[PDB]
Design a protein around this ligand. Sequence first.
Ligand code: HEM
Ligand code: HEM
Ligand code: HEM
Ligand code: HEM
Ligand code: A1H61
Ligand code: A1H61
Ligand code: A1H61
Ligand code: A1H61
Lengths: 341, 341, 341, 341
Amino acid sequence: GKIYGEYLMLDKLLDAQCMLSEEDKRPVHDEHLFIITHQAYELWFKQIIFEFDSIRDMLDAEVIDETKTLEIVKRLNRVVLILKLLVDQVPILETMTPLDFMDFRKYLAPASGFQSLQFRLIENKLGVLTEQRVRYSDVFSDEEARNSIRNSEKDPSLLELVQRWLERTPGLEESGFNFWAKFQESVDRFLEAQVQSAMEEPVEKAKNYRLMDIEKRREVYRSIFDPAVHDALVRRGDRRFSHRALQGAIMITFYRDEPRFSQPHQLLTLLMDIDSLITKWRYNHVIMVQRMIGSQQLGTGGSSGYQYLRSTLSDRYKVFLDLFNLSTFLIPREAIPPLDE
Amino acid sequence: GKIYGEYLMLDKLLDAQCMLSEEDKRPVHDEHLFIITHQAYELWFKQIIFEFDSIRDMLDAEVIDETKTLEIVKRLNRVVLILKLLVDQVPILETMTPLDFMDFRKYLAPASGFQSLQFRLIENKLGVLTEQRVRYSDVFSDEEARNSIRNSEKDPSLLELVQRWLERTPGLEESGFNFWAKFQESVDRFLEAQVQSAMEEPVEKAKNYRLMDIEKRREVYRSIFDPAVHDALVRRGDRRFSHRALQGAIMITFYRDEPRFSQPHQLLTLLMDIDSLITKWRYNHVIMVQRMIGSQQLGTGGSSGYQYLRSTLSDRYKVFLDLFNLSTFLIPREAIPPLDE
Amino acid sequence: GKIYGEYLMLDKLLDAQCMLSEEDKRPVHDEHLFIITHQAYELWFKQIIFEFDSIRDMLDAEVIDETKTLEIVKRLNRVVLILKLLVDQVPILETMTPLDFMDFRKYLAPASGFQSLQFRLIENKLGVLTEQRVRYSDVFSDEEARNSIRNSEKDPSLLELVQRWLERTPGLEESGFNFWAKFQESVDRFLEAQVQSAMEEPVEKAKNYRLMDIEKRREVYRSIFDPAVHDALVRRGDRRFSHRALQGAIMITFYRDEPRFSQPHQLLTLLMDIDSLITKWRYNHVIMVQRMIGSQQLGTGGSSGYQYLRSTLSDRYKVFLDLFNLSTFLIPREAIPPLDE
Amino acid sequence: GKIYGEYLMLDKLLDAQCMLSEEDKRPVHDEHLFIITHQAYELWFKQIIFEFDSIRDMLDAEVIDETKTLEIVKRLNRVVLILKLLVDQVPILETMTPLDFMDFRKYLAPASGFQSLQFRLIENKLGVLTEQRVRYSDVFSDEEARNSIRNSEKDPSLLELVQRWLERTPGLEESGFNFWAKFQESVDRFLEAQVQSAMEEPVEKAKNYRLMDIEKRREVYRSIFDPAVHDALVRRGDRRFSHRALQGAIMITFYRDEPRFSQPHQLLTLLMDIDSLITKWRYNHVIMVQRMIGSQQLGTGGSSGYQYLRSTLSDRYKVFLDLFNLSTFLIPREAIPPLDE
Ligand code: HEM
Ligand code: HEM
Ligand code: HEM
Ligand code: HEM
Ligand SMILES: Cc1ccc2cncn2c1
Ligand SMILES: Cc1ccc2cncn2c1
Ligand SMILES: Cc1ccc2cncn2c1
Ligand SMILES: Cc1ccc2cncn2c1
């Protein structure tokens, strides 16, 4: 179009609000809010997908320069703001009372939140593993929806592309900076100095606490320095990243204050914020489900739905799970290998 | 429809996003965000209108009981939450850079924010007076849009209906409680006691300050006790309310802690919050216009647009202007006529 | 005092910021933010306690009128707003980097979040049961702190006082409205009508699903109509409320649209919002702990602390647990016993 | 100290809450909220000052590297988050009713918001010019407060230091990139091409509108290319920046997408966000003053105070006024001189 409403296709957009309670000559006022709220979510889901696909295209390249990294950071930050808005949309729908919802939920019988193609496309494009999902894709009767999901699982997710970018971190290379080995030998040097300082403790409980603590540190570093331990944790589902991607991620977090790593760090932080905000939506949605129809109601066949949503709050659904635990492996500033390159 | 996407008409809704930069084979990524942002606004504008029209129907009645008042309060509070969300949508669009916007604003030449039928319908249904508007309704080329605006100006606004409800306040009546006269004579009694206390001041500057202050209080009460002064202020545009509606509003604010007036008070407060939040959107929108194209750019013909938006921030656009100044006329708790009925 | 700084005792308040890294001639800039953030929390914790104690005094009375209920609702809503602000304070402290925190966390060795007297007083005054707490009160070395906690556990909590108020609900009484029996017999009448409608189903899978569903409804109502089942669930820790308090709570939620119950309903909703917002703070605090020092760091002696905080997210810490599940027991509007009194 | 309360000096901090209505044996509950709210503001004002002074020290240097720029950006962003929290604190105090405030505002007679030393120190350290202030520093009776303000006006503000940093922008130099001249000659080339395109317009109203518009563009560029026009606008108070600082600011906004300028751009954006958020606090504070005591009340001596606060909303109080208008001078991407260096 050309003028405001023609450009925005308001003739199409504002003709998609059909209250089924109205067409059945028993209108329920808040059903208009129910529709509008979901359509605002679906509009922003399309925007999120559009931004995710553009970030996937920029990450599916041999090298990602400082200019392309800034663009990726901008678009990830935009997704963060849209996710906060989407979390904030819940109290607007929580304004409808359970009895008003009960008077129209009968018209929704075949419909299901599981049938949101865009919500699934978001989960898949970010990296929610099909094997890590709770049992409880085949809900989608349409063939274009099934084809859309097939492509989202087949094509590389944001998790795979970020890992590839993380593995190519300059500075990890043995030929050059050799960060991983410098980190291993400074961890050994630091942890021994901690043993020597604890040996000089005037009190025995304090000497023993420090020594027990150093042993727990030894085990923490063993989970990342022994690749067999890391690869076993990845297999269990406690980690997502490859051993080399984790090395890159750890190096980015160590040198975040350096101009060269501040932007890659921000990209990782926004990836974490996205995960955390999708989890916040899941929680607020399960609180709202509970407020409206409790753990189970007429038509639900028990607390099956409720318990499934409650189970989506687990680390099984966090894509960049590894990013939250990087500070466990941190060493003081004085102990970090200085940058030379 | 029946299943999720058919119920929500996602086939229609998600087919209304046409980037003109894409159809011209010169696509600008952030134009997708520009469209989606406006469509989320337009969806919520429709919800606001739907709630406003339902509140108008409940207020266009002989008596509004405690049950219907609770429903009106709920729906006004819902509009408050939607307005906060709409204010919060601005930083999402402020994520687009001026240079990216400059690469597609050429395709928008005939379009204008003035062509938002729903934004005008919101202003009119709330009560933005046609005579109080800045010079700078005839923008709308379509006949259904012109007819929609004609009806919104003709049919009673939220301002007119609230005034009618306010005029019917029980307790204002001479036959019963006679609040206005009790308020006048307690104002006189309180202000004289203030003169007597100031007369006993040991310091002359303090006695004189108190006496100058009591004189300014006398003039404040004169603007509401002399109907000629109030009616002149309404004529100037400094007030909106009729003299009897203002009496009701003042009585509701005085006895807000009493169960009988707490709900009418909350209705008035939410009416104020709505005004204040529409003003907050106007401000954030003028800040965003400024960030994107400054006070004037190529195609604007000077700072005409900018200065008009900047002028919409004035009290000329506040519908319930009177509601913000009710605390100027307040007297201590000890001086308020006790409720009997 | 009398002037601004003397009234606010800014001489005392702005002399309580002692950076231990500064006194050790190794200053860490963000330690100032660490102190200020905690002091803003402690100031608002004192305000929360002050409001909680005033609500406890109003609830520790024979009858609570409509006027005192409005005051309680106002103060509960104030606590909600302060809790949202406190949740929002986390991203301000998350602005400090893990390496900057690592350079001063050594000076905090004896200090512990467990030593916040005001946080414990908040938990106790709301109603966090001492037996429902995770093993992991005796941390407090001072005698006035131990005496403060002793009194908070001994004196009635907000949970006990709300239950007393809920038990005294007019309308529950057999002598008058007899709500519980009317609810039981309308549940029986409604559930049988649902069996008869399911019997007329043309499809067998649909008839069987409806019948399986009605059986699950029968069991839900059994948990509240058989007092032995409710009393067993209270004993297990799945419920907090007495059988009579639950009856009152259910009646308030059923007739919330009625002027008589809207205010008691709002009080219950704000009580739920408080619980939910304290849970949101706990979550954001465990995310921030994780961002700063992961699941374990030098000095922690393993993931003991982290796992304890992670366990505070369970229903074991939700005081008004029962309030979230009231919609499970809801019946359509057509099936609710009409109000007469 | 060493343990939680000793480290945070909670013995001092939680002993600074003296309600004057309580000491006069006429306690007003919400006076506790009034005190706590102001003390939370004063605590965060101290944090803001601490961050501002550290940014002043980093900016008072010959060269500011990419590493020091990241630190400045981090601390400015922290101030943004604290300012949002401070804006959000207003609705918490707006929870107190005007009648409850009226029962204790008598004890505040000598106190005044003008006596907040920290609020003035914030305004001065940011750059609120003493000559640009409204008539209505000498309020401060204490000598350490007068000395604190004297030093804040004497020592360079954030506005002066940012201008110095902006003037040293590499790329502005004639010897090297010579941005200003390249910008002038590309503006001339672009504006002439616009005349030639308008000359080919089939419609005369369209040709004339385009030509009138190009003339308004010519005048816009004249205000920045003729230093006499810029220096006259600075003198009038419509601009703050020196002609060379404005050149740097314009160059940073033009090449913001380039890695070299993205961080300097972010610093400028956060400086704008700070200005805008202090303005948002001023507005919310004048709305809250109005809600509590209207435009004037007993003790105010008329609307003097109210009108002064209402006048602080003007551009006279915006420190980085110039930053909001930089998009007025923008040219399309195709017209921007390519970077070489
Ligand atoms: C009145 C409020 C709502 C209720 C009672 C509700 C209830 C439910 C229930 C019971 C489920 C489980 C499967 C099913 O029966 O569909 C579900 C899933 C879902 N709903 Fe909602 N919902 C509400 C509002 C919303 C809104 C506003 C959205 C946003 C678009 C939404 C999005 C979803 C999604 C995406 C799922 C999938 C859950 C996941 O796999 O993580 N719901 N909902
Ligand atoms: C890129 C950001 C935007 C820019 C540069 C912009 C610019 C403008 C300008 C210059 C005007 C004056 C008349 C005209 O030329 O149309 C205007 C008016 C208006 N715009 Fe925007 N706008 C933006 C985003 C939005 C958004 C997201 C909305 C929300 C739906 C919106 C709604 C309106 C409305 C309703 C008016 C009427 C103003 C009033 O009468 O108070 N604008 N806009
Ligand atoms: C730099 C950020 C912070 C870190 C790393 C941190 C870490 C921790 C840890 C590890 C614990 C477990 C016991 C202990 O070692 O003290 C804890 C408990 C606690 N912290 Fe924090 N904390 C941080 C900030 C805060 C803030 C800003 C507050 C607010 C006043 C706070 C309040 C508490 C409270 C009240 C507990 C008790 C937890 C409960 O029983 O639910 N913490 N913190
Ligand atoms: C009950 C709410 C409040 C009322 C009625 C109120 C009223 C006023 C008034 C009338 C003035 C003008 C001079 C005077 O008489 O002091 C003023 C100034 C001021 N107040 Fe408030 N105030 C309130 C709350 C606050 C809060 C919570 C803060 C935050 C610390 C604050 C900070 C200030 C500051 C800094 C000024 C200086 C204004 C400027 O120069 O821009 N006020 N206030
Ligand atoms: C339309 C619709 C139906 C069911 C549902 C569940 N969660 C969101 N939903 C939306
Ligand atoms: C589509 C469109 C065009 C112009 C405009 C101005 N303010 C919002 N707008 C939206
Ligand atoms: C001072 C201090 C020490 C330890 C701690 C843990 N969570 C908050 N904390 C505050
Ligand atoms: C204590 C106090 C007195 C007066 C005042 C005005 N604005 C904030 N204020 C605070």
